[PDB]
Design a protein around this ligand. Sequence first.
Ligand SMILES: CC(C)C[C@H](CNC(=O)Cc1cc[nH]c1)Cc1ccc2c(c1C(=O)O)OCO2
Ligand SMILES: CC(C)C[C@H](CNC(=O)Cc1cc[nH]c1)Cc1ccc2c(c1C(=O)O)OCO2
Ligand SMILES: [Cl-]
Ligand SMILES: [Cl-]
Lengths: 148, 148
Amino acid sequence: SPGIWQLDCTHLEGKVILVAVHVASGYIEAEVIPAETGQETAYFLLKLAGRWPVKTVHTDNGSNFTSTTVKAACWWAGIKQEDGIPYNPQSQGVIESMNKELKKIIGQVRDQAEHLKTAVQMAVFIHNHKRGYSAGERIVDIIATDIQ
Amino acid sequence: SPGIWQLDCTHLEGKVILVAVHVASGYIEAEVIPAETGQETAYFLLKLAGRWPVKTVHTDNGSNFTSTTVKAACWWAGIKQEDGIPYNPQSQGVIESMNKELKKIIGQVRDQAEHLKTAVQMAVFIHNHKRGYSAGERIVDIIATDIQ
Ligand SMILES: CC(C)C[C@H](CNC(=O)Cc1cc[nH]c1)Cc1ccc2c(c1C(=O)O)OCO2
Ligand SMILES: CC(C)C[C@H](CNC(=O)Cc1cc[nH]c1)Cc1ccc2c(c1C(=O)O)OCO2
Ligand SMILES: [Cl-]
Ligand SMILES: [Cl-]
């Protein structure tokens, strides 16, 4: 559980926002990319796994699950690649709600930045800091407990 | 101490590698940029502060310390901007040694990736995972102890 992440791809302003969610805490990292390709997803995962102890990733779709480049990155970084099928259906709704929430925050900051990528990083900040603990606090506590 | 980071700019292959070091743990995040501008440094800091609880940043040089865009990002993210003057001179040698170490790792992986940015993220991964605890383990424990 401390090492489980879920990928999530959402769209805004004709661009793609790729999100990784730490399932147990709700903590996220995100980036704007021109389109979801295997190469972009693979690079995003390499970044994520260098920053947090990523053991398992539930991939967001079958193309990324199949991608040889995504598979290469998961091999390189020691990540177990799994499907993202919500066997528990409350999983879908949780991600859906998060995408709506993230888009809301993006709208609230959009005018403070010229570029979407900046607004997305502002949204990541607000999401991870929002309080009762924050997602940032929860992920650190979960991983620290696991290390001990 | 749990919230203190230091910026570090190093060069390779005609490109710029911007690094943030969590001083107490040795944990890093890094990116490749075409050149070190206020705008790039500001964006990097916004990303960092959304991901870790960044209280204080020792900026890497006077141009970034002065930059209105860097100041705007620090204001936005609640970061206290400080100079990076090594009043304690062992600070300079520590960063120097880390840049040499990072470049060594980059050379060891360079052939496994087409692009420098990829090699840098591989280097971040290896640096943060290297063991006795790793830098990734130390930063999590430090912040968790602080939260409690
Ligand atoms: C920290 C926030 C409050 C401001 C900065 C600077 N932006 C402005 O002042 C433009 C402006 C906004 C309203 N009127 C004029 C945002 C920023 C920082 C770094 C970047 C950016 C951006 C961006 O604008 O997307 O793009 C890539 O690197
Ligand atoms: C996970 C590692 C082991 C491989 C991947 C895929 N690269 C190759 O297979 C090319 C190759 C290298 C040697 N011979 C053929 C690296 C990678 C992933 C994602 C990216 C990249 C790169 C990159 O190559 O820089 O660039 C931006 O998005
Ligand atoms: Cl790690
Ligand atoms: Cl945080």
